[PDB]
Amino acid sequence: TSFTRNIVGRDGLCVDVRNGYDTDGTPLQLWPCGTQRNQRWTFDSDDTIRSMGKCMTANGLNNGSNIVIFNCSTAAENAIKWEVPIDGSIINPSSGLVMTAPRAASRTILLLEDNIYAASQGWTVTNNVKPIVASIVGYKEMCLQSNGENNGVWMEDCEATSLQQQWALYGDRTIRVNSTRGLCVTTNGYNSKDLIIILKCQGLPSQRWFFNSDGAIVNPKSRLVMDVRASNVSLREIIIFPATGNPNQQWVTQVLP
Ligand SMILES: *[C@@H]1O[C@H](CO)[C@@H](O[C@@H]2O[C@H](CO)[C@@H](O)[C@H](O)[C@H]2NC(C)=O)[C@H](O[C@@H]2O[C@@H](C)[C@@H](O)[C@@H](O)[C@@H]2O)[C@H]1NC(C)=O
Ligand SMILES: *[C@@H]1O[C@H](CO)[C@@H](O[C@@H]2O[C@H](CO)[C@@H](O)[C@H](O)[C@H]2NC(C)=O)[C@H](O[C@@H]2O[C@@H](C)[C@@H](O)[C@@H](O)[C@@H]2O)[C@H]1NC(C)=O
Ligand SMILES: *[C@@H]1O[C@H](CO)[C@@H](O[C@@H]2O[C@H](CO)[C@@H](O)[C@H](O)[C@H]2NC(C)=O)[C@H](O)[C@H]1NC(C)=O
Ligand SMILES: *[C@@H]1O[C@H](CO)[C@@H](O)[C@H](O)[C@H]1NC(C)=O
Ligand SMILES: OC[C@H]1O[C@H](O)[C@H](O)[C@@H](O)[C@H]1O
């Protein structure tokens, strides 16, 4: 009824108890992922998340409050309970605030903030601390492909040798250009028919994605899903659009060798 994993977030960095200290109040931070105990988090049936025998704890329940390690028996019960929504948030149910990495850098301190469905608020609970590398196969069994920073993504015939068809599925719920991992699949707005492009990863809601159980790739802020515009691969436009279940909105990941 408990199991232990790493927690991967912004830029593929892991949730880490700072300096490996277990003193009550020690802040959580981002740090490159490893096997050290201060990165091993045990998920207990009581909705606590523990490292080094102590609990992930909200040091306050306000926008901007720090998250720390703290003795599980002496902390406030409201401060040590966490849920893991399917879209990859880590939420404190009492406050409704979510774990956020406000900067990408090593040593960034983790805060509880208002949920804006930002990529800075995306996490993955896993023992694999490397991004998953896959092709994204969609409409007509074609492959999603990048075409440079600031340019659109679009469909092409799947090629084992096309590097721009290779995507790094990061723990922060970003979809990155595998060869250029500073770049993220980004919606150019939150409205229906806004185009999906590649932009520098900046932790934004426009860069957060969720692979749901219907084969859709969902942008949580907008609610909208990746769509091959007009079921017309020749337009070379992928947009966000409301979920319809139609073939031009169906996607599956295919792991690469
Ligand atoms: C909760 O904390 C956030 C970080 O302090 C606030 O957002 C930040 O607001 C700053 C100005 O106060 C702004 O320069 C930051 O870039 C922005 N950060 C991001 C990425 O959102 C947030 O403030 C609200 O949202 C911002 C965008 C503005 O609209 C503010 O007027 C809002 O108050 C804080 N939210 C709350 C509940 O106050
Ligand atoms: C969390 O805080 C608890 C209360 O201060 C610690 O339990 C207390 O540990 C004291 C020092 O070991 C001991 O004199 C007390 O009997 C005990 N108090 C209670 C109510 O159990 C607790 O320490 C852990 O649990 C106790 C029972 C022993 O097994 C300790 O050696 C454990 O470390 C603190 N937990 C942690 C992880 O620090
Ligand atoms: C995706 O990109 C990664 C990162 O560049 C590639 O992984 C590197 O591969 C080289 C050659 O095998 C290794 O020596 C490095 O250790 C890898 N780096 C990291 C950080 O993992 C990878 O080959 C690319 N393609 C695929 C299919 O994963
Ligand atoms: C698909 O898009 C291409 C490129 O713009 C266009 O020439 C073609 O007529 C479109 N096909 C349909 C059925 O609209
Ligand atoms: O705080 C920086 C760094 O300190 C040590 O190197 C720890 O082992 C890491 O896990 C990390 O916490």
Ligand SMILES: OC[C@H]1O[C@H](O)[C@H](O)[C@@H](O)[C@H]1O
């Ligand atoms: O115009 C955009 C819209 O075009 C058609 O209606 C498609 O079926 C939708 O999925 C969407 O692509």
